[PDB]
Amino acid sequence: STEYKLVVVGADGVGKSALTIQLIQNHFVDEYDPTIEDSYRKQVVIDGETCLLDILDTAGQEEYSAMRDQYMRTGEGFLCVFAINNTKSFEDIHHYREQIKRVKDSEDVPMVLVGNKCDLPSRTVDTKQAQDLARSYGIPFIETSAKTRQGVDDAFYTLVREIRKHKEKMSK
Numbered sequence: 001s002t003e004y005k006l007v008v009v010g011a012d013g014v015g016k017s018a019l020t021i022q023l024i025q026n027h028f029v030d031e032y033d034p035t036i037e038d039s040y041r042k043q044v045v046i047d048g049e050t051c052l053l054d055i056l057d058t059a060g061q062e063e064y065s066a067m068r069d070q071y072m073r074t075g076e077g078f079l080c081v082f083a084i085n086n087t088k089s090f091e092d093i094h095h096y097r098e099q100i101k102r103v104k105d106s107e108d109v110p111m112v113l114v115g116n117k118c119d120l121p122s123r124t125v126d127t128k129q130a131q132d133l134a135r136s137y138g139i140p141f142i143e144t145s146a147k148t149r150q151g152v153d154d155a156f157y158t159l160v161r162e163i164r165k166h167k168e169k170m171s172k
């Protein structure tokens with residue numbers, strides 16, 4: 001049954017890895033071990049379909065643009081992660097989205113906007129501005145905490161649903 005290529009993107013330190021490790025291994029990585037490029041497989045059942053999630057966990061800042069280009073080419077859907085106490089990471093979503101659209105030569109690419117670290121008090125990106133961005137892109141917005149696991153499954157499952165809808169549209 002269907003495989004889904006998910007790529008988790010976002011700035012340094014936003015919690016891409018912590019989110020992915022909560023999904024796969026059900027614990028919170030308290031440490032900060034910066035990523036080069038990690039990948040994970042997981043079988044799940046989403047809306048009664050068995051899915052093989054093929055997950056790419058990308059680096060916060062890449063050494064080569066061709067390395068960004070490549071994961072953007074292979075990925076079927078993108079988890080666009082920012083941290084709610086990191087304004088720059090929120091602003092980087094624009095720049096991710098532009099690079100993804102350019103690389104794929106398309107205006108309609110499955111994505112979900114994720115505001116991570118919702119357990120913190122340090123909030124410099126308000127919910128309304130995130131929801132506005134998402135509404136503008138025409139994609140879902142999900143608030144998450146990898147610390148507590150709030151929203152983690154919903155984030156990844158929504159992205160799968162987004163890919164399914166995109167496939168069903170692209171046939172029509």
Ligand SMILES: Nc1nc2c(ncn2[C@@H]2O[C@H](COP(=O)(O)OP(=O)(O)NP(=O)(O)O)[C@@H](O)[C@H]2O)c(=O)[nH]1
Pocket residue numbers: 010011012013014015016017018019029030031032033034035036058059060061116117118119120144145146147148
């Ligand atoms: N309070 C809180 N801390 C978090 C959350 N998610 C990640 N962190 C913390 O933020 C730091 C960086 O997390 P990490 O998952 O490594 O971020 P990343 O986006 O994968 N970093 P890189 O881009 O270098 O791979 C770690 O200290 C981690 O524990 C969260 O939801 N809440």
Ligand SMILES: [Mg+2]
Pocket residue numbers: 015016017018033034035057058059060
């Ligand atoms: Mg990481």
Ligand SMILES: [Mg+2]
Pocket residue numbers: 009010011012058059060061062
């Ligand atoms: Mg990055």
